[PDB]
Amino acid sequence: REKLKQELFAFNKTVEHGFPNQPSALAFDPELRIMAIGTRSGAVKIYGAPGVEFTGLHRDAATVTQMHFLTGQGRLLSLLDDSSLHLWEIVHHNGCAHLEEALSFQLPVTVVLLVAAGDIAALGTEGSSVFFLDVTTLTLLEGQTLAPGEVLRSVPDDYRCGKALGPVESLQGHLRDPTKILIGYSRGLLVIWNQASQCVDHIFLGNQQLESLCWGRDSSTVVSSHSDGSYAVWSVDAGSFPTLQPTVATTPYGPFPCKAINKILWRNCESGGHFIIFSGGMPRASYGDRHCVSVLRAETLVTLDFTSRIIDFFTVHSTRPEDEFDDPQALAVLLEEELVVLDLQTPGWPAVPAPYLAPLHSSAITCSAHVASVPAKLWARIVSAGEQQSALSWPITGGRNLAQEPSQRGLLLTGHEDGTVRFWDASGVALRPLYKLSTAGLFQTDCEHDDWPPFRKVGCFDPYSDDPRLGVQKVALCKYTAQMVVAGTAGQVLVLELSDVPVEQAVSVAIIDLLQDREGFTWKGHERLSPRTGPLPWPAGFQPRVLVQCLPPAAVTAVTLHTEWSLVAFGTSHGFGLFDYQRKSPVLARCTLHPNDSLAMEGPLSRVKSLKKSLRQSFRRITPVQRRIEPRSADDSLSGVVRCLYFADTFLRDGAHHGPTMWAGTNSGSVFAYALEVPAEQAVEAVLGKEVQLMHRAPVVAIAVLDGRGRPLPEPYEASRDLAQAPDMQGGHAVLIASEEQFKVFTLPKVSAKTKFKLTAHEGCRVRKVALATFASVACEDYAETCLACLTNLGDVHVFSVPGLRPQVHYSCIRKEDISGIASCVFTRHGQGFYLISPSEFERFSLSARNITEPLCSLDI
Template sequence: MKKFRKVLDGLSSSSPGGVASPSCGSAAGTPTAHAPTPQDIHVQETLVSENFQICKTVRHGFPYQPTCLAFDPVQKILAIGSRTGGIRILGRPGVDCYSQHESGAAVLQLQFLINEGALVTACADDTLHLWNLRQRRPAILHSLKFNRERITFCHLPFQSKWLYVGTERGNTHIVNIESFVLSGYVIMWNKAIELATKAHPGPVVHLSDSPKDEGKLLIGFESGTVVQWDLRAKKVDFRIYYDEAIHSVSWHHEGKQFMCSHSDGSLTMWNLRNTARPIQITYPHGKILKDGRKESCKPILKVEYKTSRNSEPYVIFSGGLSYDKSGGRRPTLTIMHGKAITVLEMDHPIVEFLVLCDTPYSNEVQDPYAVVVLLEKDFIVVDLTQSNFPIFENPYPMDIHESPVTCTAYFAECPPDIIPILYSIGAKQKKTGYSHKEWPVSGGTWTLGSQTYPEIIVTGHADGTVKFWDASAITLQMLYKLKTSKVFEKPKAGDGRAGELVEEDPYAVQMVSWCPHSRLFCVVGISSHVILYRFSKHDANTQIVSLEVRLQFDSEDVISPSEAENNPCFSDPSSPQPPGSPGSGTQDSLPCLKVKSRPVRMPPGYQAEMVVQLQWVDGEPPQQITSLDINSAYGLLAFGNCNGLTVVDFLQKTILMCMGTLDLYGAADPYQRLTRSPRKNRQSTSGLTELSDNQVSMDMERSKSPTSGNATHTHTHTHTHTHTHTHTHTHTHTLTLQDYHVNGHCTSPTSQPCSVGKPRITGVPEGPRLTRRGPGRPPFRKAQSAACMEISLPVSSHTEESRENSFSRSRSSSVSSIDRDTKESVTTLQFGESYGRKGDALPTACLWVGTSLGVVLLLPISIPTEEEERMEEPITMGPSGTVLMLKGSVLRFAFLDCGGALIQSPYEVWRDPNGPEDPDRTRRRKLINFSPSSSQEACGDGHLAVVCSEKQAKVILMPTQAVLFTHNITESSFLLRADVVSVCNSVCLACFCANGHIMTLRYTVGLSHPNHDSGH
């Protein structure tokens, strides 16, 4: 078990008094008089280390690599063993328990002590374990190790104190189940067979007591020999020899006959009155060929022979298909009932099956009512009481990985009505054909704890499905299933580029964003598409709006200052279009998938409203989306990748902004990025051989970005000038910007690598455009290269802060380590009420942007307040010049008021978009706003921003942008996930580290507490 760090009791202050970061940029203006100072912040800390401990709860999903199965017919509980030593005990829905053998040895067989709350396990390390199930957590009471023989089969008769254990050598040992020690009674193989027989009969493959006499033990050997041993007289009653190997044996309840299954696909029936030959030999799936030979069949691995009061006996077995028929067929379970033979095909290989009967006594009529079938990757129960043998609907969350899980999201304290609504809608989706009877595994009891609250887990899958699970109780219960692939046309051969981008699973879900209050749901797919869903209780015919975005910022040559000043940012639509543009008639500027253009009838539940797709550019597929956020109150959706950021107004169905990552900095780029050409600058470049965190270049000057010419403007009216080529499904022509992007190197695990581009076609018609550098070239060159890009940090008197800001795992001390073709990705996004600049007096709508280089950017948003204006007037947003710095890729944002309480993002109260019109109620949007000024009064306006990267966490006071606390979370590793969560009426930062540590940090203001680390 990996380490678990309990509580890191404070965020170490990086500078006394909380000095504003020198890397922070701001617009002109002075802080408001009501802005709090660090001395005004008083957070009442209540969390201590004892509030946190690691605790095993439950394992969800299908058991990994199952091996065996057992059932208690009285208590009606089920046990499943696995190859990794795990035991899963299942009862009625909600009863689910997992235990693990410390040795990790595979569980070969399970035997319940029927109606006694105990279980015997036989493991691959030849050890028997007796488990006590009558306690909260099952535990091993006794263990018995076989040192000289390997265990092959076990049998425990009902209400018996003797456990019979067969071995590989053919011997049978007897264990006292109460003391769990060997009794000393051993049935040796050479005494079980005739003395004249010299051949070894093979391992013991079957043990069972006679239904007519519990003092008689039937022993089956692999070679085909069956022996009935008299336990009292210690002698053999009879011996049976058969040419084919035996796999299993099953008694008739009267104890006069038994049936064997064999390796040649045959079933033999034996009568105890005449054991010289079988009274019946059948090949259920084999035929007699024309030449008189029998058709070769696969082995029948197990057979169950069960009698019924009101009908003929059931013969149920697995395997036995002819080799010719089984070539293209799936694994089967065969049910023979009288003359009727039913073959049930399975999706996965059968591990084991059990027939459930009304009685635990083997000498009574069995009356089977169900068959439990354990498959390699599934678990089903067949109803035997109906002639068509339907299956029961499985109440356990066994199908979590029905399609591989590609992303997960957890939501706590959801609105109390959301779970019943999702369940009622999801219940209508269920397949027909299930058995109407109650689930037969109905044992055990469970109760809800006193601290329950609505919890939902959302899983995205490789086939494009999304599942909502109720996680409020012990076990997961699926509430609702959404198929995102229904939004798109089925791809045809040679149509589109989805096959070129993703050969399999083009609809795989990469991330989700869900607002439980407004019930807006957003899905990001692997084909660089974003789908927006709204929830409705009514079905509707909907026209899905399709928007396409050209977010590919590559350059032939990095722009020089003179070129940036002389060339406009937007191309003239009348000028000749370069290859790959819509005007060229090529297959570029197309998305990977095709959205359905006709109105689609959508059932109640989540209904697709809009699809945004990234386009192919210059023969290159769009880069995968790395970040996503949605806000129902603002009506905005934002997503980013390694090329830049896109913001969508989903109320007006328009692309609000599409900018490259470098453009987001405006004039506040903390890195000095400039180009050198040997023809223009022949200075010695020997000083470029090393770039370290301790050395900051003093003589570099900033290269102007395309937006640097008007960097003094605080807002960019991107509604009218969008840095992209966009169009809806009506394909209206808009401006196309030939954007550039300066590549930067990032190795953060949260950043996805960008594919290397293909060389551009030469001979591009001249016109207003930006000079481009081939995307196939590396973004940084060594000193002797034709072009060299340098990165340095802004010169500051705060040496320690500069050294801290210079750190990133994406920037190394050697030039060669940054000589790679990757880019600065947008790794996290967060909408909220905040202060875009130091001089802001009131909070406004903002978009916080985090990148893979540890940069935090703030984009203020101007949104019309009146609803009529909101639907018609444009929204303005753009870079504010505020830039904050952290070590490593930015993972998470959170906002606290000055009292330490978590500030939620504003949201719109849900209303049914397809509901009937109510003349007494207005259809206006109802917005709930949690602005910092409304959540506090003691310290005036302002709030705390918590920013966490994969290396570091900072608490920043807004709007002054003073860094109150900085904590270096890890030096030797990096964080994979982080989030600010509420615990015990307080908040903490929970982190999951790549080295297996789980850490929690609290926000102690003014104090620095030592870190705590638990043992292994």
């Protein structure tokens, strides 16, 4: 080989896409104008501007909840559920600007805060004590420390007799002047304390359990919250030192039991009414379980009701000490499943759209599809449909994107439990949402569903499921003629035209019986959806040509189209069929179940399903466990599931005529090839070629026909795209079939093993997913050979060379553990792939040496 492979492929990861999993901490910096998010997985991501991202991940993968930025400086503090604290530092690596850890701190824990101009940090613990740190060098200053006995020495007359001061909490920073810290103790006691003179400047009394403190930029008044639904408002002056009773103390929702308030922010010093924003406080007896933030100004109070738990919130405002305005432009809130931002310029306070960090999960992701080299006419039609279906300002606008404009328009498109397809800009560093198609509009509903709290519902994330069988099982898209097929859980399959005009039409629906001649097993599972009859209004965008339905409403495990021929194939747990959309008659249907069965004709709950046992040191009692060993058999599993549906123009009958053909593939290892008679009064006819039956019965996962130049057959309508696509016809074709444990290729007029490879024999493995891809060389890209990439059940990716079936590389892409990540994969045709490392996020890998991506940013530190 002499290293010729290294021009073709090498393995990389790229940074993730979509909202972070298990969010936990937040920071914002008004002077760099950047935001950071901390997460229970130990991640520290940063989201400063469109196309800007960074990511730390600590040495120790512990949970976090505190983050602070040194405002205007290359550094951040992040606090762990552990005793530890450590400093993150951002550096302009010459291309690849990145975050890296500087220094570590320890004590023999609860909150931290920082000071501007008088550059100091302060920490608070679970004991009633406060400590000070110069952030320049991670240590406490041994003299600047504040024990409970010192702050107790001041004592008001009720507390003079008692020493039992509760936990330190809610350290709040300075307020224009450089040396004052505000301190809370959960008991209800509140102090303002001076660093430069080591003394109390004022006390504030309090009696109920505490959980917030706040400062106003002009210190005429301050606000605090209590863990009983109350909040204390206080004024400050040099004569107010004894602080006998609060100035404006209240609970905002009536005489009722009303939970707790966990944060307050104060924005009152602007022109107009008293902006106050707070989390919790809702009446527990009627509005207890739900997650909400209340915003008050003057007589206008609204509660913002969120579909997931609130982590933290911040307001867009200026830290310049010479400013006199609290300047609240926008409020941003981190929920457990979304980040929302809302602008307060106009009454009713509009939500603001997000350029990044989208909630991909908002209905659960059921499938991944990808298309590459997309036509500019189609892309313009898709974004025109997107913008047609869909002050306005984005505040988080710090650093700058240095990456290139897309030279390869890749689209990743995804199906969701809601019966919706979403389109995403897969090109370059990050996704953007293009468009959203709802299939759900076709089907009738089988089932169906200010006040005292001033409620308005906000966030795109939905915690409810519409129907279990609207969900999209497979998607495929035909770039060259703007047609898409989508397939669902109740045997529905839609083919849709892209038509960038609003119009009203009635679909044609067909139903096909897989067991038509075969005797009826009794389907007691999912009852079929009923399409709404008569004409329906449709949006400019994808609109359904026709609907097809399967007799048993099983999950459509496979679908494909060959648009030149005008065919679609669809395949279920029980059988497959062909349909021509040009003349509406079905071409064929076939059942491929064994003549008796177990995992079929049943409801969603059943006694028979036995779950294959774990081998971990978790998940079992403390230590041997049994697994059996056995040759596969004709009824060992759900053996009638259809995995492949493939179209090819190939010599199957005889070597003279290049006839158009379709290939099914099944869990049984049965490969029904069919010949087709396309017309140009008459309709397509189909007849069985050679059934190929595998020697080991392992499920077929992919079928690809190699044209006699060793190049796969092209994509369907590619005769509109190139000369170079035109296949060989003079040399006889071979068919490649991938089973779950070995690959074979065969010569189509006489099926004989040209080449074979057995992975699992040499090392314990199985193949989950297969796709064929091309590898243009990093230089002299004229050398652009083809390979199949296979995803192992251990999460490894292996690349095999066609037709030779030799393993080129052996790479550890995904872990053994994340089976839902392995099951989510799609491959781009250029040796790149997407997988779901969380239901919230896609991670991306590249194994082509030419197609690669890196972080590439700069910032005015």
